[PDB]
């Protein structure tokens, strides 16, 4: 069950109620590029704040298809929808409601605590290694070396 | 004792809090605490700290 | 594959009777900032 | 450390390069434990167990024994030298002279050189040592004790039966390499091994190489490690020679893939660290010291530094 | 105004400098000797192998 | 650490050049250089030679390759009657300092050479000027030659 | 992969109902002439406050133009888009969503998470350095450089 | 003790806070907190400092 670009767009139109399966009116194909192209720039800027997730980008000179595969996790989806929901809701002219704008923030939630690193602080490297570590039969033993790299 | 803070304050500012005992950094970034709508309620200040 | 010993690992090396057998001792200190890059020794 | 030198009419440097610290590792890692473990009933210790100290005595020896037979498995199979051919055993006393010869022209300076033996090369050594003309208490030594000296041919000889033994594995065919391989020096400083892939073997043989096996490359030579010089044994050239790790087979094709140890580091870019004359190109031959399916206990020659021994002191239980 | 110092190895002499050119956190050193040769006659030497 | 390994580099590239030039300059030449040393008398030759052209003060050496030296030992140890040469040639392998007149020496680094190609039965075209007042500075001399290969680069190498 | 500077326009007339297909609008030329010049003024004012990312202006003698390229990379492409429909909004009189102020105010502090640099505190100069890092030998210094530059003895 | 700030609240004026112990300036400047509308919610002031 590989994740296509185009099924995330067919998802956030779906939430809202945009255009579903039984809708009877359905939006063209254009607006279908148009969601595309946006998620692609909305991943672009979140390689910046949150960490990169596996995204697959269009390298090259083409440009992005919705049937592409995104490479993304099945966990991610809801959180990579709503946030493009909430992304484009205004290309409609609408107003989200607190019940979607809640779900959003549990869901993009659960993905930071997904991605979640916290880094440990090492000695300056000045530090004096104690008597008690036998501090003459390595390197870095007089002093701690800090940081690597 | 250690600060608290959350996950959308510090995101993308670790490296800046991680060496603050070896650098002589002028300032220190850290975000504010938004809702759900985008209001602002809290400060820029960490929550608290450990006792 | 992070802790080290200090002692480096013994190599490998050449051995020196070409310079103990040639003649070092006609000329030593000879070409001095007087004489130049060149000096001459005489004939039987 | 290894470095090159410059050559400059009046020291003028800018416009060239400098040497770097590129810097090499070599790890060693733990075992697996040698455990002896016995049980007995309260009855029979009670009434039929008496002299359980004499009884239990060789059980140190034992885990001796396994210990000594398994390093040396490990310093046969990790070794990467080679002299001679399985074919023939030591008879002459130059068979014992060559390893200090070679050792000595390829460099090596610190610590001492070793030679082990089986009993019957001993035997046979022995035997040739009686025929000498001139010194008397030396070949009356030889005749009574059939012994040898300390110094053997300006190495120190031994001679234990410790010694393990290995099969040779199958093979055949004119074998040639196939792909060029990666012997840059920053590519195999970490572990001295390679893998290459060769071509021309039997359709298809399980246990083609064993491990032990040794493969000669014919047109590369060795080079002394200090000048980077090549090496010559008056009229023949030494040719680089190397290890088989762990068992190969080969498919339809005459295709095998194996690993060995002891690398032919040809670097372009750093010529620090070259120890050999040229790089192994695609399509050149190689071939296997020994016979199809010989086997024998073989013999062994290293110097100080080349292998190490350690026991980790184990802590009580609760 | 160079850091420099003499180490001695079998009777050769061998200068040894130290500076710090570059911005780049980049120290370097060198190591300097200068030889001097000479062919008296050259009827009193050469070249020998063995013979059949 | 890096003190220890420089020095060693330039010794040895040192020594190398040496050997290079010594033997660059050197004019005597002995035996056919294919064949390697074996017997007795291809290191007694030399101090014969030298003995012969008339050079007497100074000290005369022979620097040989650590293969040849074994080529002598297992040579002497075949001795019929000396107990201590044919003690240590058994046990140590170590060849006398004084080896048919001459001091023989024992390196493993030493400089080889490339003959370079060469064809056709050479001989003189022009008569050179050997008179000492052209070479009583140099003791060298320029010749030219005939009967050469038709065109090839690196017809005469160095050495 | 090029990001021109007609796709930054038409982005905002998008994120927007000005001119989209979802609208049922064509485009006017005029909108896009006057996006073009406001996107050119907006990004010649960023060079102080925001900084420098990129931008690539016209000569003097031409005009810009929509399909010319623009040089920014493809990760702003949002957050100038934002800032330039919240700049222009005022032009047809229409007033933004809250929505579209929060988007536009969390792609801004995306944006300004990537160029971020903090300065560290060099010594004053007239501070001392201990006898541990042996001033006499391991370092000529024994005082703290502050500004001078390392010496050339050529400049003096 | 570390002074803590937001991005946009020092953004531009970081030289004059890097060099205010080597200078002697008679003030040093800083913006306000603004939210998403352009109100002002916080004075002028640094949010807090670390302990």
Known sequence: ?149 | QIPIVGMEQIRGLEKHWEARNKKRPAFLPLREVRDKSGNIIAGATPAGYTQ | ?44 | ?318 | ?52
């Open chain 3, 1 to 44: 594959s992070q802790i080290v010993l200090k002692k480096f690992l013994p190599g490998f090396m050449s051995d020196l009777v070409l310079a103990k057998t040639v003649d070092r001792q006609l000329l030593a200190g000879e070409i001095n900032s007087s004489t130049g890059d060149s000096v001459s020794f005489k004939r039987p």
């Open chain 4, 1 to 318: 450390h290894q470095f090159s030198s410059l050559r400059t009419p009046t020291g003028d440097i800018s416009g060239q390069n400098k040497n770097n610290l590129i810097s090499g590792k070599a790890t060693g890692r733990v075992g697996n434990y040698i455990t002896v473990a016995v049980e007995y009933q309260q009855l029979e210790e009670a009434i039929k167990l008496n002299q359980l100290e004499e009884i239990l005595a060789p059980v140190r020896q034992r885990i001796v024994t396994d210990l000594e037979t398994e390093l040396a498995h490990f310093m046969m199979n990790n070794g990467a030298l080679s002299l001679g051919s399985p074919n023939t055993p030591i008879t002459k006393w130059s068979d014992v002279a060559q390893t200090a010869s070679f050792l000595k022209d390829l460099g090596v300076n610190e610590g001492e050189n070793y030679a082990v033996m089986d009993p019957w090369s001993a035997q046979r050594l022995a035997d040739a040592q009686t025929g000498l003309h001139a010194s008397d208490q030396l070949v009356r030594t030889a005749w009574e004790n059939a012994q040898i000296p300390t110094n053997f041919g300006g190495i120190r000889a031994l001679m234990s039966n410790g010694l393990a033994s290995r099969t040779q594995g199958a093979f055949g065919g004119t074998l040639t390499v196939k792909t060029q391989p990666t012997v840059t020096y920053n590519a195999v400083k970490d572990s001295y091994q390679f893998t290459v892939t060769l071509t021309g073997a039997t359709a298809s043989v399980t246990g083609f190489l064993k491990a032990g096996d040794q493969v000669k490359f014919t047109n590369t030579y060795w080079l002394q490690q200090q000048t980077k010089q090549a090496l010559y044994n008056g009229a023949t050239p030494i040719s680089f020679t190397a290890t088989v790790t762990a068992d190969a087979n080969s498919d339809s094709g005459g295709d095998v893939t194996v690993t060995l140890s002891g690398v032919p580091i040809y670097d372009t870019t750093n010529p620090q660290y070259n120890s050999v004359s040229r790089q192994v190109e695609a399509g050149d031959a190689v071939s296997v010291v020994g016979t199809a399916s010989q086997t024998m206990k073989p013999n062994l020659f290293y110097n100080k530094f080349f292998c190490g021994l350690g026991s980790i002191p184990l802590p009580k239980l609760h």
């Open chain 1, 1 to 149: 069950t590989v994740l296509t670009k185009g099924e995330i767009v067919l998802f956030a139109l779906r939430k809202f109620a945009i255009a579903s399966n039984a809708s009877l009116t359905d939006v063209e194909p254009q607006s279908i590029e148009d969601g595309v192209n946006d998620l692609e720039d909305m991943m672009s800027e979140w390689m910046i704040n949150p960490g990169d997730i596996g995204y697959a980008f269009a390298t090259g000179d083409e440009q992005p298809l919705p049937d592409d595969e995104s490479g993304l996790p099945r966990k991610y989806k809801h959180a990579v929808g709503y946030q493009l929901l909430l992304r484009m809701l205004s290309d409609y002219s609408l107003e989200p409601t607190p019940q979607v704008l809640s779900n959003a923030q549990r869901s993009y939630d659960a993905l930071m605590t997904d991605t979640l690193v916290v880094p440990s602080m090492r000695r300056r490297g000045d530090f004096p290694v104690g008597q008690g570590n036998k501090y003459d039969v390595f390197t870095s033993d007089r002093y701690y070396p800090g940081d690597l790299p």
């Open chain 5, 1 to 52: 105004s160079i850091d420099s110092a003499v180490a001695t190895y079998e009777g050769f002499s061998i200068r040894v400098h130290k500076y710090a050119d570059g911005d780049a956190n980049v120290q370097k050193m060198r190591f300097d000797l200068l030889p001097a040769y000479v062919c008296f006659n050259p009827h009193m030497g050469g070249q020998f192998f063995g013979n059949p």
